[PDB]
Amino acid sequence: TSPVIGTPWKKLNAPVSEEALEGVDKYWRVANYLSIGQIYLRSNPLMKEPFTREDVKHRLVGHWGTTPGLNFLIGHINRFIADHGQNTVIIMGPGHGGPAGTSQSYLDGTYTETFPKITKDEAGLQKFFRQFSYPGGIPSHFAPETPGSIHEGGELGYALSHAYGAIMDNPSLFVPAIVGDGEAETGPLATGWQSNKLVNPRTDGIVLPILHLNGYKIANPTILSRISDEELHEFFHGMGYEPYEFVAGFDDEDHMSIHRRFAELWETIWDEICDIKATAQTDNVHRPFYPMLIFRTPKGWTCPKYIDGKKTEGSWRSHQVPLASARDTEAHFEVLKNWLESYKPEELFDANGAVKDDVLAFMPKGELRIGANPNANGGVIRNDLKLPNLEDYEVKEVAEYGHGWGQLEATRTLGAYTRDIIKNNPRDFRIFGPDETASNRLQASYEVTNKQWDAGYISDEVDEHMHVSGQVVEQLSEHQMEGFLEAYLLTGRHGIWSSYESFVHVIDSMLNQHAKWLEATVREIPWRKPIASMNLLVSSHVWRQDHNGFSHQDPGVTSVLLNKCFHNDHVIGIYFATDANMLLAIAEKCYKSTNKINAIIAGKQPAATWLTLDEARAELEKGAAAWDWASTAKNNDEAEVVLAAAGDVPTQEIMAASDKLKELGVKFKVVNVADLLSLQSAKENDEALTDEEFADIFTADKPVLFAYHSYAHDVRGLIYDRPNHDNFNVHGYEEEGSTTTPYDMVRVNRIDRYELTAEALRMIDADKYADKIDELEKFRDEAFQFAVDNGYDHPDYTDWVYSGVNT
Amino acid sequence: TSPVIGTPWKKLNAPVSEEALEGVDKYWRVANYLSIGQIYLRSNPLMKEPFTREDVKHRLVGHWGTTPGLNFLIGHINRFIADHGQNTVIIMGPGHGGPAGTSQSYLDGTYTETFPKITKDEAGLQKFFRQFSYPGGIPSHFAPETPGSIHEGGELGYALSHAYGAIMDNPSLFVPAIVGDGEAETGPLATGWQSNKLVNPRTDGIVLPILHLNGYKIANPTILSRISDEELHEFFHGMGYEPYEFVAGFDDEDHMSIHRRFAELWETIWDEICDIKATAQTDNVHRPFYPMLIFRTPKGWTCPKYIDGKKTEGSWRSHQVPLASARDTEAHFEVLKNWLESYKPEELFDANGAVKDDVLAFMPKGELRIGANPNANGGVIRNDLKLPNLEDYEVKEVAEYGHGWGQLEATRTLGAYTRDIIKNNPRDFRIFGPDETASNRLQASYEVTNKQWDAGYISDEVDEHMHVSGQVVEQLSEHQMEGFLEAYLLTGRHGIWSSYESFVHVIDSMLNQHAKWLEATVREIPWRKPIASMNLLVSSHVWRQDHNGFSHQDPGVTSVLLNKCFHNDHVIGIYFATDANMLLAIAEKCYKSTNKINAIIAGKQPAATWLTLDEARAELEKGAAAWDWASTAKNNDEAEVVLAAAGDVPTQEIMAASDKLKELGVKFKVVNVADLLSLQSAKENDEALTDEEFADIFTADKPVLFAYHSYAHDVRGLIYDRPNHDNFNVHGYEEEGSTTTPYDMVRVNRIDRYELTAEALRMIDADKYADKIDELEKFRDEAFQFAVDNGYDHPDYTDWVYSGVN
């Protein structure tokens, strides 16, 4: 549960002191100096003579354009924090402005506190400049390596979804969220503005959007800087914001005036925020118009206005570096020298190379500092969830009537379970879902909380299970749902979201970035404590999108997640819920886990339950398992074939194939896979099955029929170095399907029980069985023709029950 | 170029007649009946007695909620088209309203012209209802098997990108883009609204966005319907639209009153659009406010208000079926029967079960029909590109100075080639880039066209190569760029977009949906003529994201595109451009290709040119090739190791490693792979190398060191049944990287020349060569330490040049 830090939502009531503003100007000037330094200088940080091109980096890596803008804002936010004692986390949309984030951390004292090698003296200042975007050094973005960051801003557009996740169930948290005007052109950013109808000003914190309207992205102007100011204002008002606009640096107005104007404006907005928060103590059912700030300043603010006759300040040319080289010529190095001198470092640094005390006297102390605030390292806040007994959700009926029982909808059991997680962990757990929580069958959670909704109510006949405050949130944007949950985890809370499988792909790129964040964190950032896993229920999956058709039939998220399964990072979970009981086992493991993206593939369709809780726990701990009770073979030598399934439906088709093989008197072994990564080469993954364990399950010499939920390519590439790999005959989804019957879905993809049975015969003795094979292919066409003619499936397919079930 | 159809941008100058609105009401009623029919009925389409339980489908598949609103709008649009002669393509954002699109096709006559068994009689009606979302019948969405569809709407969000793409260079085309109020909550849709700053009312057509504000998505209200009307209007006005709102169906207003108000509003919005189009002939540097329409009607409109005491009209409950079963009880059956009778079908059908002439008399005829419009079968519009002679762009310096010459930036040649395609094919070719065209080094295009920009200008010192019309469009949104080009293609034109490799992932799901579109088309839609291919330049790739770091290091698009490579559909291309010359040869194949998505992985960094064109073309046609001139072994028995590379940089490190193995006297074959699918099993893919050709290139029995651009998993999974697949040692990107140097990038992923040379020697004799392996491992840390001390790479890495250079 988020901590109450500082003295939240306090008005100042006095003007901002001239003293504190002189601080901010110094912060600004020194942060700009540190920022140019990190880009340009390998040595001689303070320009002690002789200062020459030998001091300048060979390759210029880093972004200036965004950075002076960031430095001004952060300077002013640091003043704000100190004077008000406000719990504040910043979201740096333009994450390519990493020099501003490292500067902030250097100057607030979290950098030295975290990297003691980087000292508050000339020598520390020198390693500090060299390390930036430099071999064996630090990233060029506001990376997880930087104290203060929960958002890299590498991949643009998640600034607002991250900002609004952070404040959820975080009533003391202020989040000034800085958004690139280029970033604002992305789809994820454009929908993120609407988050203000999904948060409550009493129970959640406050996000102040700051649009960094610097006029440009890389090689273009931005749309929002070149529409009318009037359009820009209606735009933000229409999305439920009170827009304030600040314009500085397009004229000769001196720095002190700029700082005085800004500080008055900032305090006027803050006053408005303190009134929103004070009102919300009495009235949290009326949605307020939340302030947002349009920060219009020239890109590259304070760089040379022109370089080699090209406009540089207030241009896209300042995007990366305004001065392409400071080595090629003396005239160029001279521009660097002048530029660095214009911040007057002689005033900012004492002879020992430390920043003077009067630069940083206005700065916050302790856990209020941007870099030290525990919300920016949410691991330190994160508690274990109080979990209910998994026993109470177990489908007991498998133990009663045998493996293969029933027509249960597995995701309902995950719903009962998550419901009680929310009940027992209020303010600490959230379900997100893109208008799919009921569709994926997770609505049992509506018994103990509601869908959070802070737009209009109209009627009890339609507005069911909705309140201004609640642990479930739903918007039709996978981006928003991935986004909110990511930031809710980064600030030390927990959750699950669900998606139709096909549409997980919408946020493939966001899985990549959070995976990279997690990969970087577990390799080389041990100060950044572990966060709860991004748990993702993948359901309404390909084999039962027979009702929605081809658009909804893509299980390929499996393939994407496999490209983040390296270096024994163990940040990817890929689980196949065989049934309700396997789903509970996976669920508990995932909800206990940390530093992972967990993807749980589970059906919502009525389906058999195969395992007891115990059998599922067992299969899950190793990842795969022989099903002895299902196997006509007694050991691997007797076995003529290995029937292996991954996914609840493949399991179903394999078990049914197994009953037809059973009647022809074939000896076969049945294998279930629940953990895809258990099959990964034991060379690449220390948690996979050993080649010995693998060979014991898949036999080493017998052919294996593998029925796989997703695309067969996934397995053929996982097991390339595995014992017996060349005897694996892998069936998976094959881009066949439409709106049809469950049976046609498996049939047309050659993973139906009939084809599986036939395939198993072909692989034992083709000629010996030529006629039972030919009988099976004929029936395959007859059952299809039965569906075409009757509009439901042949009763052979429909009415089948595993032989192992008794009345 | 898009053809001019009908009489575009024409005002009525008259009231909509009573006759037409009577027809629109009959259209609306019959579309509703045909829609419910398609959902509910296996037989007895006209409820001839006995009409029972048994005439109802066992399983209800389809969506009612959106359908009556869609039927209403499409009814009014059909009237409009006929009255105006207006070249009109609709975008059905709520594509789950399929029955609206099927009904429309069946009613405009294109259904029976395209599918002769589905007749305009009771037998046809019976087939038409049964086939909907039924095994061996047709899809539940507005799929490509539906005449008049260029947009399925299964994956919501792309309504507006497709709308705006359709109209680029399409000045006669009007696109009513119907948007879900739920769909409007998606990221892609939210930014799609801003496209009106990137289109020009003279050189492009007009999109009319229609917010289908029926108040609900599946199980929730929509944000846009439960905020104040003032906010809703401010929002659209802020985004450069003049918002008009229509409210109907919440009260007892008679249907004719509703049609009269709507038709009046509609012609008012159409008048403004005609004014914008007339103004734009004279002035087109001043962006107008484009009308958009807020359509506020209750979800499931005209279904029973309450069923079993639950509100169904004007509720999320109407989303799928307002009536969950019509077979379970007599009373539910009566609700279906009553509902169907509420449209009074006996006034709509003749004794033969044909829709009465008086119902369809207002409809468009011929190519104006939504179903017949060539823009919805763009392949009937597509011409072959007038391509310049590929010879004129070849790096000739490989003939003169030899194989491995130069520090050329390969994308720059594609830029020149593509420039001249635009000069030769004006209004038929477009570049899209998310603010990355210059960065990907395609700026040569600016010599003949401009970035299209219809927001504001301030200064010649910043606004270079921008004009209100131009064939290059940037917006920082992959969705927008992908979406725009998808529709430019679907409406019968050509182009390419570029993206940083890592960020192609943003639009993974749009590749999926476009792939699936082309999969269904080549399999069973022979009447949908072939479209130009979706050409994607994948550059600023993982091996040269040394300057941005980990975030920008993901070449995993290859992984995604492999999951659409089946049934010999041949709709995916994955090409690695070895160099400028291989790039020119891939470009040419891709630009001539139809019905494809082509990923072209090309380096923008300065690199060696390896092949001449003639050789490049020979490698491509096969997909892979023995490099005879680079091999020290002169047959497959002689060779102790095969060195294979796919990708400009894995190639580089393989060629450099071949020099180190030459000096050791080692006998090796050098193999380059340009078509990733050439390697795919011969059983799955009939255009792959035969097992024979495969074993002949990679040898039957020798160790192969494969240096791969992307995730090794790709190549491993492709070759599982190939000759000698077990001897493949595949190296690729491994999620190692940072902000560092070119050499550190290959080093940390174990694909630098040094490691490859060591890995070659490990595969021959770990024993014989232990001494040389250890030397090469030590030189890796020594060349990393060099980079750390100095801030640039060791000259053995930096300055290296292939032995074969003069």
Ligand SMILES: Cc1ncc(C[n+]2csc(CCOP(=O)(O)OP(=O)(O)O)c2C)c(N)n1
């Ligand atoms: C999703 C995505 N697409 C493309 C890029 C490439 N990119 C990185 S920075 C940038 C421009 C950023 O412009 P803006 O947000 O206006 O930033 P600022 O002016 O503050 O530097 C672009 C196109 C990206 N980082 N992420």
Ligand SMILES: Cc1ncc(C[n+]2csc(CCOP(=O)(O)OP(=O)(O)O)c2C)c(N)n1
């Ligand atoms: C990208 C995407 N995410 C989720 C879904 C699942 N989905 C199908 S229809 C729908 C709701 C549709 O709401 P709206 O756009 O309001 O359509 P209408 O009410 O007109 O049916 C949802 C969430 C989808 N089809 N596509």
Ligand SMILES: [Ca+2]
């Ligand atoms: Ca910007």
Ligand SMILES: [Ca+2]
């Ligand atoms: Ca809707």
